[PDB]
């Protein structure tokens, strides 16, 4: 068989010391069992900020500095924050044109829901920061 399967997360199977399971050195982790070398903790500096500090079992988790929002999977790239009611596009960030909105500091502007198409009234008209909330369907 192969006894490195026995080694839990937080340790590695040391091929120099006859497959004993020693814990992970400083600034290092192993997220699964069986690993022959521990992995280096990601360090969050500059554009990023440490959210969850790294353990022996788990990597570090990086936020983005205030005014910025994590772009990719795992907060890899880092994009800037427009305010509510705006959309950052090409050439900077601009307010949403009338009839559009954005409820977050992220993303594009979507057009308002059109209530008239389901026979519905408009209970509260939309702004640039919130959508129209539609009234009761005329099937009631």
């Amino acid at each position: 068989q192969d006894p490195c399967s026995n080694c839990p997360a937080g340790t590695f199977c040391d091929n120099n010391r006859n497959q004993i399971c020693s814990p992970c050195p400083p600034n290092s982790f192993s997220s699964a069992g069986g690993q022959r070398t521990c992995d280096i903790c990601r360090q969050c500096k500059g554009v990023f900020r440490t959210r969850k500090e790294c353990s022996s079992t788990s990597n570090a988790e990086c936020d983005c500095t205030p005014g910025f929002h994590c772009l990719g999977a795992g907060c890899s790239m880092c994009e800037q924050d427009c305010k509510q009611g705006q959309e950052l596009t090409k050439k900077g960030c601009k307010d949403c044109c009338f009839g559009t909105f954005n409820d977050q500091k992220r993303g594009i502007c979507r057009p308002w829901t059109n209530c008239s198409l389901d026979g519905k009234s408009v209970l509260v008209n939309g702004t640039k920061e919130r959508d129209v909330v539609c009234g009761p369907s005329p099937e009631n």
Partner: antibody, heavy 121, light 110 residues
Amino acid sequence: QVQLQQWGAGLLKPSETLSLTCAVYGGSFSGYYWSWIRQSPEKGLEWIGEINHGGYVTYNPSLESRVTISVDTSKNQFSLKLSSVTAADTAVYYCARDYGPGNYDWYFDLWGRGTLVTVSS
Amino acid sequence: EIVLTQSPATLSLSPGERATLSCRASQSVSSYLAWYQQKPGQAPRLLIYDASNRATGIPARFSGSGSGTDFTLTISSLEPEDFAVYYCQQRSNWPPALTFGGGTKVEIKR
């Protein structure tokens, strides 16, 4: 046709230091782990520790505080040093080569002849 | 540590009979267990490794079995050379441990 010869002091007073040496004849030294094992009539067979060509060591925890195992790769020799001995450390000390069939070297396939060490005031 | 306990302490059998020795681990050791024979004044000699495989010079009458916490060494038919002390040995990496049993003396029944 590999074989191990061991030698060293066999009679020590308490507080002194046990020192022993094993020499490998007729094979390579690098591919293996080399162990020291002692046998007591009181405490039986007890593994002390192991070393390889790279000087990487594992020790039995019950002994780590007074054990040292070292290697001389120029003579294919490893050696054991046990400090602050006591009557309890009287035993036959063996050197041995670890063996395993797989990715582990977890048994003992080849043994020295043993060196009896007595400690007494 | 993990402790291996052999039983019986000693075994008295007449030549040609069948010897069955036992080893019990205090927690599981999977199959990472070996048997050694030791004749008086000699070093121990490896017989069985990985619970059930003979080492190079070992004859056919030696046989091992077991996995987990209960292992048996079987000598199918005892011969004069086979009356000695038999030790079991285990190794573990989690938790790290290397230990032997207390031994079973196999003695000539008279």
